[PDB]
């Protein structure tokens, strides 16, 4: 649903995520996963609420093993927040929506500093 | 107190642990890791009985770094029987890491339970 949710995929991930200016928030999902379906409405409400501050996208892990592998995603849903090109936060599972909402807000405020205060 | 983990033994020390595991991925040359060390060590001391606390040098252990897609240091992760549930990257105000840890101590297991393994 747009919401402007991007469908990311292996072959252009590096352009769309790692070379992004803006923060990126990603849901790793599987079409088969009941927990992903449970989270989906809230991912879409928060994507709309915060669209001006971040990019939001989903990547199907049934079909995109390379990016799952790259980030060590072992289950679905997995939410990940990217700053400049780099992961800053992750949470796995069906979680209360407010936990997702708050971690997005927190990373929007802190995420750039987290990345500045890490070494590659 | 904290356990040094290594590639060769990771499957036993981390993935086969019955207790949850909190891992700090570090480099000896990283000032952000250095700044976070005492706090990570204090948290290991407060919650020793709920979880195993450990750390792994990524310069010397490239395989687990690749496996979990670690791209900067420090990266903190929480594991439940070898499944990653949460991560945060960077030097951060340390109580943010305490609260994530406390939260995962009580919620990490149900998070993994409410998720679908990537091969399935």
TrEMBL record, chain B:
<dbReference type="InterPro" id="IPR036249">
    <property type="entry name" value="Thioredoxin-like_sf"/>
</dbReference>
<protein>
    <submittedName>
        <fullName>Thioredoxin</fullName>
    </submittedName>
</protein>
<dbReference type="GO" id="GO:0005737">
    <property type="term" value="C:cytoplasm"/>
</dbReference>
<dbReference type="GO" id="GO:0015035">
    <property type="term" value="F:protein-disulfide reductase activity"/>
</dbReference>
<dbReference type="Pfam" id="PF00085">
    <property type="entry name" value="Thioredoxin"/>
</dbReference>
<dbReference type="InterPro" id="IPR013766">
    <property type="entry name" value="Thioredoxin_domain"/>
</dbReference>
<feature type="domain" description="Thioredoxin">
    <location>
        <begin position="1"/>
        <end position="106"/>
    </location>
</feature>
């Amino acid at each position: 649903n747009g919401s402007s949710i991007i469908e990311f995929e292996d072959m252009t991930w590096s352009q769309q995520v790692e070379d992004s200016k803006k923060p990126v928030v990603v849901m790793f999902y599987s079409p088969a996963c009941p927990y992903c379906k449970a989270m989906e409405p809230y991912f879409e409400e928060y994507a709309k609420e915060y669209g001006s501050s971040a990019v939001f996208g989903r990547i199907n892990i049934a079909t995109n093993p390379w990016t799952a592998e790259k980030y060590g995603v072992q289950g679905t849903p997995t939410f990940k927040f990217f700053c400049h090109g780099r992961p800053v936060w992750e949470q796995v599972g069906q979680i209360y929506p407010s936990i997702l909402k708050n971690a997005v807000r927190d990373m929007l405020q802190h995420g750039e500093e987290c990345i500045r205060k890490s070494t590659p």
